[PDB]
Amino acid sequence: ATAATFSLSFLNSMQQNTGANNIVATNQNGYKPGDLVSYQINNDGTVVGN
Amino acid sequence: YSNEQEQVLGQIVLANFANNEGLASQGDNVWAATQASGVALLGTAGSGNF
Amino acid sequence: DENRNLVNMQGMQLTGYPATGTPPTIQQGANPAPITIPNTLMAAKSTTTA
Numbered sequence A: 001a002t003a004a005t006f007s008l009s010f011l012n013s014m015q016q017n018t019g020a021n022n023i024v025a026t027n028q029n030g031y032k033p034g035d036l037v038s039y040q041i042n043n044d045g046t047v048v049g050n
Numbered sequence B: 001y002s003n004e005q006e007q008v009l010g011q012i013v014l015a016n017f018a019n020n021e022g023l024a025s026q027g028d029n030v031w032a033a034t035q036a037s038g039v040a041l042l043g044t045a046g047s048g049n050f
Numbered sequence C: 001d002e003n004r005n006l007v008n009m010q011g012m013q014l015t016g017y018p019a020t021g022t023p024p025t026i027q028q029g030a031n032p033a034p035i036t037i038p039n040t041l042m043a044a045k046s047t048t049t050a
Helices: none
Strands: A039-041 A045-047 B011-016 B041-043 C015-017
Touching: none
Parallel strands: none
Antiparallel strands: A039 A045, B011 B041, B011 C015
């Protein structure tokens, strides 16, 4: 499988002054292959399939 | 182990939410997180607000 | 588990951060895998530094 080419970004990071270096948030816009476990209607009407 | 040291086999991940009352309880003692609770904030015990 | 995955009695596997490398280290990186304690021996590795 040829490699993932992705923009890894350190935006909104800051330099704190007390404590240890700690990853406050992480996000990635890819996922695993899965199928369907549930479908529901939310209170604004969005039919969402988990 | 029997060679005088240990090794770490994992670390218990705790996960608090945006609101605690938003999670949908499931058929066992476990809960599950929905759009009423948002995505889990993962973390390690004793660190931050965990 | 009988495969020694840490579960509660409802069959649901407890999840934690992975511990990889020799010697293993808590890989505090928001990717919780199922915690499994092995039966295999700790294989002897050579002295990197003293």
